Amino acid sequence: NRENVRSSDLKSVGYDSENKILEVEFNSGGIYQYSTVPEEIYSKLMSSSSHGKYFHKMIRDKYPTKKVK
Amino acid sequence: NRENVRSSDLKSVGYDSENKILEVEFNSGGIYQYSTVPEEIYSKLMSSSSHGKYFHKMIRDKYPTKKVK
Amino acid sequence: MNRENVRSSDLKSVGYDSENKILEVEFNSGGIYQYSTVPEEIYSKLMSSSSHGKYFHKMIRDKYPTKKVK
Amino acid sequence: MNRENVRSSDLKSVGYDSENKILEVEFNSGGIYQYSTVPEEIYSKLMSSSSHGKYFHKMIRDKYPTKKVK
Ligand code: NA
Ligand code: NA
Ligand code: NA
């Protein structure tokens, strides 16, 4: 479900628009799920010139987060 | 600016079209805020049969949820 | 037919799903978006309107849950 | 409803909302963490536990989506 990405930080990104869950794979190896993420956040994250900078600015710490790997 | 239709087990429901945030009170006393909730989600919440059922199917776990009281 | 074409300075084609209440709008600029919990009548007024752009602006956009499909 | 105070070496108050599935834990460090999709019965075993901390760390932490709120 995860579309590949470029950042020095994250490898792939998946979205469940039906349930508002973002899923991010990171280059280190960890996979993390983000809850109640609005649609355009996922859109803006995917159309950012930098994917890693948008994540730390607008996503990390600001949505409920669970680890998956 | 709020209104007790109750529901399957709701208490009171209010909204801010101007800010796109929903407010919902529960029978256990709590009141929760929901952000970036589009207008018609708030409307056909209220035209629905049982509004808790809608809440639990179409709002819970889907918008930025923030305790207010 | 997925989407029926539309003459507008803004909208290109519109399609509707009677079952899951999803409207699909394509724009002359290329974007495609699905609109959830859209009532049948709302899709009817949009197609019957004399300015699809003006009806879309007033009665659809930023009012129903929006998803970008293209 | 506000949080209930608690006897633990790690947390100090806990509130729950059966309908929403929102847990709220206030720690003996001073943060408040909010846990989503927590079933009603996990919250009860927590308030009923001989050690709230040993239960929370084993069963709730790193098992439900978490968000810092204070
Ligand atoms: Na980067
Ligand atoms: Na037009
Ligand atoms: Na303890």
Q: Give C23 Cα–ligand 2 centroid separation in angstroms.
A: 18
d(CA D20, CA C42): 31
- Taking the centre of ligand 2 as the mean of its atom positions, its distance from the CA of residue C66, in whole angstroms, is 20
Inter-axis angle of helices A51-58 and A39-46, nearest 10: 150
- D46 CA to centre of ligand 3 in angstroms: 10
Residue indicated by tokens 């529960």:
B26
Cβ-proximal residues to A65 (8 Å cutoff; 6+ apart), any chain: A32, A33, A34, A35, D65, D66, D67
Output B54-59 pairs: Cβ under 8 A, ≥24 positions apart.
B55/B7, B55/B10, B55/B24, B55/D19, B56/D19, B58/C37, B59/B22, B59/B24, B59/B34
- Chain B residues closer than 8 Å to D34 by CB: 67
Facing residue for D19 by CB, picked from B26, B66, B67: B26
Tokens representing B10 are 């709701």
Determine whether the interchain pair A19/B62 forms a contact, defined as Cβ–Cβ distance below 8 Å: yes
User: What per-residue string of b and e applies to A25-59 under the rule 16 or more CB within 10 Å gives b?
Assistant: bbeeeebbbbbbbbbebbeebeebeebbebbeeeb
Q: Where in chain A are the domains?
A: 1-69
Resolution of the determined structure in angstroms stands at 2.7
Contacts of A66 in chain D (CB under 8 A): 62-66
| Token pair listed for B32 | 């929760």
B18 interfaces chain C, CB cutoff of 8 Å: no
Instruction: List phi, psi (to 5°) of A27.
Output: -65, -30
B48-57's contacts with Cβ under 8 Å and 24+ in sequence apart are: B50/B7, B50/B8, B51/B5, B51/B7, B51/B8, B51/B10, B51/B13, B52/B7, B52/B8, B52/B9, B52/B10, B52/D19, B53/B7, B53/B8, B55/B7, B55/B10, B55/B24, B55/D19, B56/D19
State the burial class of residue D46 (Cβ atoms within 10 Å of its Cβ: 0-12, 13-18, 19+).
buried
Interface test mutation site (partner A, options C20, C68, C69, C70, max chain A beta carbons within 10 A): C68
Give chain C's radius of gyration (CA, Å): 11
Please report, as a single letter, which amino acid is at residue B20: K
Instruction: Tell me how close the Cα of B58 comes to any Cα of chain C, in angstroms.
Output: 10
N-term to C-term CA, chain A: 15
Look at residues A68, A20, A37, C60 and name the one whose alpha carbon lies nearest to residue D62. Answer: A68
- Residue D12 tokens read as 């100090």
Q: Do B26 and D20 touch (CB under 8 A)?
A: yes
